[PDB]
């Protein structure tokens, strides 16, 4: 969660 990176709207990471 504290690692995630949101590129943009709708795409989510980690």
């Amino acid at each position, epitope marked *: 969660t504290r*690692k995630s990176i*949101r590129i943009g*709207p709708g795409q989510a990471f980690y």
Partner: antibody, heavy 124, light 116 residues
Framework: EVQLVESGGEVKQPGQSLKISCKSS????????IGWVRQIPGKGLEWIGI????????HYSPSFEGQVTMSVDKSISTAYLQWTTLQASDTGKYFC?????????????????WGQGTMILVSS | YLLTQPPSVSVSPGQTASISCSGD??????VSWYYQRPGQSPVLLMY???KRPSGIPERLSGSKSGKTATLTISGTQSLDEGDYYC???????????????????FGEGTRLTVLA
């Protein structure tokens, strides 16, 4: 305070190795990703790579993968980029930064914190 | 892709400068804007298309239509002269797999001249 503090400016020779330091403080060093951007001054900004100090998952820019290496050392909360072998292109002002998780409603990310920059002059 | 920006921009004092940023994916990628004075370090101005980070004045505003994102500064002043960079990302799972590849692209920047 919240600040990244970086090693001083070096004048290196082509083919010399190199390793620069970015010490971090004011937050949890492992929970926020660390960044490395270059300033080829007069020219643009040039992103190099990210690493997560907790596990060291990285993402190298496809232009430094192979010529540059990013590491972290947690006990001294310090992030490192290093060359095995320099070259005149490797010249420039190296900034390390901190990637912030803006836990907004719909979340996003960005670089709110920046080291003073280490200046590297590669020449003979 | 890549982020494109006007190498330079001019606004007369007290007036509105617009700085654009064009990318082939920006139709669907959060843009962020940075400040830099010669010699000094980059400053976050804007993130997630429009979100001003704290301490950054309401006179600066951020928008993005299509594959184009715009930094707008009203009430311009000598204190605004410097360079401004749009940034964004890019991912891509490998077709062979092996995870998801992340990339941070920056525009080349816009020297803002305030015609004092």
């Amino acid at each position: 305070e919240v600040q990244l503090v970086e090693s001083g400016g070096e004048v290196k020779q082509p083919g010399q190795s190199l390793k620069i330091s970015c010490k971090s403080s004011g937050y949890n060093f492992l929970d926020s990703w660390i960044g490395w951007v270059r300033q080829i001054p007069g020219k643009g900004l040039e992103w190099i790579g990210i690493i997560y100090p907790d596990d060291s998952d990285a993402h190298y820019s496809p232009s430094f993968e192979g010529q540059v290496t990013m590491s972290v050392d947690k006990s001294i909360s310090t992030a490192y980029l290093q060359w095995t072998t320099l070259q005149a292109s490797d010249t420039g002002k190296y900034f390390c930064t901190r990637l912030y998780l803006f836990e907004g409603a719909q979340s996003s990310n960005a670089f709110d914190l920046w080291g003073q920059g280490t200046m590297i002059l590669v020449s003979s | 892709y890549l982020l494109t920006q006007p190498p330079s921009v001019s606004v007369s004092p007290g007036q509105t400068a617009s700085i654009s940023c064009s990318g082939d994916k920006l139709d669907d990628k959060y843009v962020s804007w940075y400040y830099q004075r010669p010699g000094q370090s980059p400053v976050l101005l804007m993130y997630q298309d429009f979100k001003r980070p704290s301490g950054i004045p309401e006179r600066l505003s951020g928008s993005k239509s299509g594959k184009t994102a715009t930094l707008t500064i009203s009430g311009t002043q000598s204190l605004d002269e410097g360079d401004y960079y749009c940034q964004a990302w890019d991912a891509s799972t490998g077709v062979s797999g092996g995870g998801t590849k992340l990339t941070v692209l920056f525009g080349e920047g816009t020297r803002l001249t305030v015609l004092a």
